[PDB]
Amino acid sequence: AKLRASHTWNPIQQMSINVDNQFNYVPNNIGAMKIVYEKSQLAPRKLY
Amino acid sequence: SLPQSEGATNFGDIGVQQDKRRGVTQMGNTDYITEATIMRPAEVGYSAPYYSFEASTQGPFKTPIAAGRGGAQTDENQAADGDPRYAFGRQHGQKTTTTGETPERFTYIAHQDTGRYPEGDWIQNINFNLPVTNDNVLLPTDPIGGKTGINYTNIFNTYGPLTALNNVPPVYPNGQIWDKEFDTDLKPRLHINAP
Amino acid sequence: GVGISTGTFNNQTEFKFLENGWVEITANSSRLVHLNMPESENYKRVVVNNMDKTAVKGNMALDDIHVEIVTPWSLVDANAWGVWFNPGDWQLIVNTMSELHLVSFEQEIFNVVLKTVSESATQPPTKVYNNDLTASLMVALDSNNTMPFTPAAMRSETLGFYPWKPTIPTPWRYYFQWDRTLIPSHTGTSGTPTNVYHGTDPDDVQFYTIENSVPVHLLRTGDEFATGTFFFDCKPCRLTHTWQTNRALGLPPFLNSLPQSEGATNFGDIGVQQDKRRGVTQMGNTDYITEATIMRPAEVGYSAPYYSFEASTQGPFKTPIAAGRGGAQTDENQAADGDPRYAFGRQHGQKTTTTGETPERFTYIAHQDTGRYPEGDWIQNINFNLPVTNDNVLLPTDPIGGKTGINYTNIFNTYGPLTALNNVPPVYPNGQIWDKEFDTDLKPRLHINAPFVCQNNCPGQLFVKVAPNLTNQYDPDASANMSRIVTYSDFWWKGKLVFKAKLRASHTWNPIQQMSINVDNQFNYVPNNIGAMKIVYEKSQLAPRKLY
Amino acid sequence: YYSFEASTQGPFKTPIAAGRGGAQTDENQAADGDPRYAFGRQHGQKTTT
Amino acid sequence: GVGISTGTFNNQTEFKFLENGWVEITANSSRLVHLNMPESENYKRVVVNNMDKTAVKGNMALDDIHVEIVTPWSLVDANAWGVWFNPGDWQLIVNTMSELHLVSFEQEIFNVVLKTVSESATQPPTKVYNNDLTASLMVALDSNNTMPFTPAAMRSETLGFYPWKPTIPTPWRYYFQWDRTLIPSHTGTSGTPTNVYHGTDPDDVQFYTIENSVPVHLLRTGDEFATGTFFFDCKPCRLTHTWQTNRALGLPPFLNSLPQSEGATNFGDIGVQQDKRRGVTQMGNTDYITEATIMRPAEVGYSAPYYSFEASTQGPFKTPIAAGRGGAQTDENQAADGDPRYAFGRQHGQKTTTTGETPERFTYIAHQDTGRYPEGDWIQNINFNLPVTNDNVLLPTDPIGGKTGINYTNIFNTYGPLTALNNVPPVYPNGQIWDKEFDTDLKPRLHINAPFVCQNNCPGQLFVKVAPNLTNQYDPDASANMSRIVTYSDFWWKGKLVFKAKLRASHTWNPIQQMSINVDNQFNYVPNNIGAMKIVYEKSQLAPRKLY
Amino acid sequence: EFKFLENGWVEITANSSRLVHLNMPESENYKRVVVNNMDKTAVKGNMAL
């Protein structure tokens, strides 16, 4: 793949860890694991 | 004309009439140039039947759709622009330390906007002569075939040689990667299960 | 610097014949552009509501709500035909060439002049114009096509079509993601339907800035600027029209009987029965072989919904159509096969010496015949069993959905992998030339606004602005508005557009339809006693071409 | 099916690129467009007809 | 000379990926600067007394008495982040790079314009602006860093953060040795305490002059000036934060017992006694091995006095602190670990379309965790013998010196040869970039105002002034004041700042904290209907990094 | 593994070494099974089932 350059002024929508996410990405006291679904295409692109 | 101060209610007005505006339209009747009227180079995405459960020699089967979004947030047609649905368990998502045998899923909703709100369309007369009159416009609310629940939206297929499209994004994890291709002389432009 | 000239003027149309009937046309349009000082030196973000036309519960195609961001930058568009050729050149192309290949394009700006206005409040008062020889012009080029694409032909915000007439660039502006909902509603639909502008999806927020994203050139009088040569990538444009339907394809029947004398009423009869005729049909029921029944290799053009006003996340919008004709003369469906409509004024057609502010237009009606008369179709039973019975045939007249005005024609989409098609011919002057292409994995087969779409590469947008001229007082720590010296600048623009085409040979016996000067045309192509000029629209593709 | 369209030359049926689509002798002869062929003496058919 | 242009405009951010994950960033900021005529063409020496706030016997941190010498010379500072990057570029750096290396810096000035103002006292009266094409600008460069160093970021006297917005240099000024005495005093301290300004120590008298100590360039319209390329010498800047204290270091205990089901209340218990646990401690008294007791390799950050307002020969001044965080969210000591405070206005953040004259600010709170909660410490006996008894433990609550408000925390300094530390992250925009270094044999480990300190060599200060334009009357044998022609000049400034960084790879499983656009952010990064712009502050180091 | 090349091109290589378990097939013979659920497709409402 290729890398993204910025062309706008306004930041682009990125992926992060909220106070709501945290424990969706870590085992637990017993070892309860799981993988959530997450949007792929999250970055503007001018069509025309 | 532009606002001279702040407020989410200070709109900049063009300052000209709809039937005296310069530009191009794809109509030979009117003189009304609107954001809905004006001629655009083409059409983004298409509009196809929903829940067009076809059938052949093997039995009935739903009609696929290559859609994005098409409405205000949590304001979508989950089936109009075809939003995938994924059911896995224990070994492909889902809380490892679960109980019983019931899959978990999510209705992946992309970010692209090619989808549609089939609840804000209409088919009216070549006469235009608006404000359009009942007998002169077929709306979403108006039944087709005499039955209620049905529409023309439900039976509608606007796919022209002018339809612009974007392929189905990756749906991770779950989602598929690569998928063989049909051995038919003519082949699908894009697959719905894999990028 | 300031004495001396920087360029030359050339608005000449050169035709250079090569070998094997190929000509190399090079149109030059050197127009003198004028430009004023941008009111705001700040970028804006304006929302347009016209929620007082979209309430009348009848008005839904009149939705003028969008979101634009204004740029102090003034653009310059020359993507038009009228700006290149004149009614006398077009005749040459159109009557004698058979195909056109768009080639090169290069812009050049010279003899920059910047003058300041001194308002001598004395009696009248009076105005004193001077030259700020140290002033500047801010020229910029989006050579890496980074910004949106705003073809200023759409809204006749092009450049003057009369060279000896000074013109004006268009204030730049582009779209900003605006989210809306609006449900239809006739004059009767009870209650208040639904229509609102939530705002903007934080995902689709692209805020462009020319200062940030492109190299800016300051030119003073002594300076000059030149784009270099850009080569386009585009399939050729045909200067021919197809007049063949589905009834004018293949081996016609053999007429066992022919007239034995003259009269427009002496028809040659085949001499055989419909249910005993040899040949091929795409039916397994009948034995009737008709000109309507017989199997043709494919289908010319398609049949789509009319006035299929769709809608998405931005709001309702009409469904485009790639149509030709499809009926007897002055016997057409102006909207069924999609006939363009053009509104310009004073500077792009229209009688120069006009009054008031009302655009003039024309509904360009091609010569190709791929269009349709949706008023002569029908959907009947698989049983056929004609003469077809009511309950066994859905006609145009027969309503659908219970409402009158509606049809199945209105809701109909016959577009099969068998649909044959011809692109949208040039609409001169007015009409557009070339148009960028959608960045969608899947792309439209053809565009409705322009014959040439450049795929991999297009020439970039030329944004022309005036540099802020400041006074002795300026506090960047003051909102006010950088009260500046009332400055404007006049500069000469030149253009070289290159086209390469082929010549038409005769193959028929009957002359072909050419362009001429009637006793009705004459004064449509000449100034008048006062100097009233104007450019009429004229059909491009007027020459037969056999489809099959 | 039986989308008999029309243009400037007159009405004409809408072609279809179909295969089968049903149990044997259980088809829509016109839905998936099944060709029909009429010849005589010199391109099939019993010579001594 | 005067026709022709001297430079070009470029405010572009270029990223060029090299090999092995190294990028070479080059930020260009070409701003158009305006500058007025210095009121005095003479150097001044002004003393500032505010001995009316320092008398209230409560007010001691409000001592605004210093000594400065004013220079007719107007400076130009670009030592800021906001002046280089935009909120959209910063995202790229910060979300995807792991370290930053400041490289090159070169300034360029072009398209010099000098205009005279003619005040035509007639009715209004009216103002007539003209061009004195023979006028001059006095550009100077302290390439041999000979003069003091006045980073104009400290007091938001930088350059505009919006390129399409014309800015203004800062009138130059520097310190002159001022001698003072001032003794503290609460609201009660009886009598008149002590506070005076003796003057100046004849030893420490440095009277600089730009005319005397640096080569001056006169540029006319036709001229141009360019600094060449200066290379900096600086350790790299990390774009990561440490979240490890002293309790998150090493091999945790072994849990002999683990929960057998879910619940945020099912804790895994070790299963052994505190006075029978194996391991190492830094105590020879106890047998208690705890997470607080156990011997750690060293100590992260330090603990110093808060609000340790010291003082010397120039007057009292607060004690700096190199801190991170040190508490639950919105559970911090804003002053204990030293959290910066930034006040700007209109031209360096803040809503462009504001009113009145009141700065806006933010208290930048990093992500690193080296800071402290001085509200959870204690000093107890060598006897230990807990549960500790009052007379055997000095806590935060327990006053020191008999006064309430005071602590031992307030007077405490735990900085040992075992103190681990992380430098002050970038604070964008506002924040400073690079800062000279003290000329003291012994030097500070790190600066509190800037991530990059250039040791051996820094780029020199650019001092920009207007040349005296004289009238027909001038007697150098007259004090008056060389009544001169009201002249000002507008010139374009360009900048090329070079940064070289590396890219971040993932090593965890859990996503890392990135920068994004919420439904709450959106309109913080876009102009508005009127063109109200503004730049918000945003955390730099937001990505874990293992300390040990 | 992510390996940055020239001109902003990366070459990603994902490796997934999983330990698979597998039991003995019940039948060592090939089958041909038909599935009828003609008890959900009778309710005259259920057709997508």
Swiss-Prot record, chain B:
<comment type="subunit">
    <text>Interacts with host TFRC.</text>
</comment>
<comment type="function">
    <text>Capsid protein self-assembles to form an icosahedral capsid with a T=1 symmetry, about 22 nm in diameter, and consisting of 60 copies of two size variants of the capsid proteins, VP1 and VP2, which differ by the presence of an N-terminal extension in the minor protein VP1. The capsid encapsulates the genomic ssDNA. Capsid proteins are responsible for the attachment to host cell receptors. This attachment induces virion internalization predominantly through clathrin-dependent endocytosis.</text>
</comment>
<protein>
    <recommendedName>
        <fullName>Capsid protein VP1</fullName>
    </recommendedName>
</protein>
<comment type="similarity">
    <text>Belongs to the parvoviridae capsid protein family.</text>
</comment>
